[PDB]
From Swiss-Prot, chain B:
Species the sequence originates in: Bacillus phage SPbeta (Bacillus phage SPBc2)
Primary gene name: aimR
Transcription in keyword set: yes
One Pfam entry name: AimR
Function comment: Transcriptional regulator which is part of the latency-replication switch system that decides at the onset of infection whether to replicate and lyse the host or to lysogenize (latency) and keep the host viable. Activates the transcription of the aimX locus. Transcriptional activation of aimX seems to lead to the productive viral replication (lytic cycle), aimX possibly acting as a regulatory non-coding RNA.
The protein's name: AimR transcriptional regulator
Assembly description: Homodimer. Interacts with the viral arbitrium peptide, this interaction changes the oligomeric state of AimR from an active dimer to an inactive monomer leading to lysogeny.
Length: 350, 348
């Protein structure tokens, strides 16, 4: 009793093997009984955060911040900052400021302070500073906690894959997602790895794209949020290839769902229904990448080169080098000059 | 025996013997002990006036002398001279400045200035603004002649940077600051040139008036004479007027481009093609190649050439001259949204 394995993966690996249907129930009861001054408790923290077991995470945090082991206290403090940042309790500026005031000592939290900043960049769609930031992480400095060493490596593979996607560097994108999948048994990371591989194939391989989305759908059947994410991914895939789309949510007023309605109606020369849908979208407040997609759809319904120029403008603003291929193709179909196209490819927004 | 500040001689040579400033200063400067502050000032004096006969003699004697401060000055003015005569590449110049382990704030300032001149002359404008903002003349507190001439240098360069940013009022204000700060003919000349050039697309007569003003104080000097001739030549091609300033006896890129530009302004396309066929076979920096494509786009009426011109103006980060292909594209009915998009995007 109170005896811990030297590496947290042992109890996790057992739980996933022998009792996979009770993983939460078993792990919450185990992690909430750890002495929080211990390496198992510090490992349990990262276990809870990777799976978004917020209920387990919050309790570890509050216990660790108040304990006398400075390592646990520091882990608690910066995971606290990540939860309060990922949920808009605090801004980006005061998180960076709070992180600086910690003078972080451990290599683990030096890595995670950067990961939580990268997650906030992924959240907001702000891809430009992500390359620099993710190059500063050096996980080889983590020598004492191999569980955290390994889980963080999965986190970096998944983020690198997402970065490579937006850079339209798709072979690398798929390499990083495959390294992610080989390295993990955490549902969240498998899910986003299958979603990224499939998205990376959106413009090249319909059947392989679909196959990855369905595999991801298979492992998250009873998670309403992941399930919907894969359905939306499949819906977009079928609109890109201009096929019959049985994934469209017609009972939704989210931007993504309505745009897919319009994209399908446009694909099938249902122009009046399509304008009705874009009528609906004009009364909703769009952000940057949503606007990019909005002008692409308007450019196609009106067959108007101007609206595609607007689409390119907003894709460049968000440093989306992947999805920008959609308006660039339609401009070409309208006979736009080759040199112009290359120029639009080469120039960057900054 | 020397004055503590070099401006004591120059101002007396300028007030009393203005018609023989060169003769008298070539004599005085080459009779200074190269180890002293006056010799270090004479080097800046000679370089700012482009009296290379004084400068290159001081550089030699200062590098082989035993005062370490005079030696450092001489070595980095030598790097300026070799780079500006294409004896060494920019990479070799940067490498050599690093190996010098520069100690004075005067040469920390001038080491950045000579890079700035190289960027200007090579059409590589995007690094200039960051680099110039690193210059801090206040650290120069022992040689006031050098502090004050470097300050004039920074005004003229700031004025040029604003010009290439298409920030034309700010351009003219810095050139005025430069004029008010100097009695050195070289800096007066490039100030009138920059003011005139800032008026190229808006005010023909005031542009020409500044060119003729710079000409009025410098015509006797062949180098300066030619610089205002070329400015007036481009002015009159921009405005598509009869052009009495064309140099038909030159094979420099600048002069050949103005021939082609004039031939195109009139309907003389075969003469223009003859000139451009020659220009094809010359190495261009990015800014020069952008002009080349603009002229090709006008001759061939080919939109892709105009897009290539914009491409190379973006690479050089010239926001002023890019107005030439933009207008031609507007005339060809190009979409306004598209042009605004090209304007807001950048090369990098």
């Amino acid at each position: 009793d109170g005896k811990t394995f030297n590496e947290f993966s042992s109890i996790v690996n057992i739980v996933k093997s022998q009792y996979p249907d009770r993983e939460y129930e078993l792990m919450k009861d185990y992690c909430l009984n750890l002495d929080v001054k211990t390496k198992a408790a510090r490992s349990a923290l990262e276990y809870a955060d990777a799976n978004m077991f917020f209920e387990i995470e919050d309790v570890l945090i509050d216990s660790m911040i108040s304990c006398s082991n400075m390592k646990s206290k520091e882990y608690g403090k910066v995971y606290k900052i990540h939860r309060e940042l990922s949920n808009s309790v605090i801004t980006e500026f005061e998180a960076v400021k709070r992180l600086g005031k910690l003078n972080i000592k451990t290599p683990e939290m030096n890595s995670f302070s950067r990961l939580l900043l990268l997650y906030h960049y992924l959240s907001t769609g702000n891809f430009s500073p992500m390359a620099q930031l993710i190059k500063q992480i050096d996980l080889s400095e983590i020598s004492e906690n191999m569980y955290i060493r390994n889980t963080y490596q999965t986190r970096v593979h998944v983020l690198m894959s997402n970065i490579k996607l937006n850079e339209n560097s798709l072979e690398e994108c798929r390499e990083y997602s495959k390294k992610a999948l080989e390295s993990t048994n955490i549902l969240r990371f498998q899910v986003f790895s299958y979603l990224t591989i499939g998205n990376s194939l959106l413009f090249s391989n319909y059947e392989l794209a679909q196959e990855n989305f369905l595999k991801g759908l298979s492992i998250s059947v009873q998670n309403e949020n992941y399930n919907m994410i894969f359905q939306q991914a499949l819906c977009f895939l079928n609109n890109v290839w201009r096929k019959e789309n049985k994934w469209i949510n017609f009972e939704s007023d989210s931007i993504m769902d309505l745009q897919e309605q319009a994209h399908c109606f446009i694909n099938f020369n249902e122009n009046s229904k399509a304008k009705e849908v874009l009528d609906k979208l004009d009364l909703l407040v769009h952000n940057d990448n949503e606007l990019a997609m909005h002008y692409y759809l308007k450019g196609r319904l009106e067959q108007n080169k101007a609206c595609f120029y607007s689409s390119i403008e907003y894709f460049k603003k968000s440093n989306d080098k992947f999805l920008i291929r959609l308006p660039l193709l339609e401009l070409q179909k309208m006979g736009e000059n080759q040199k112009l196209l290359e120029l639009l490819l080469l120039l960057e927004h900054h």
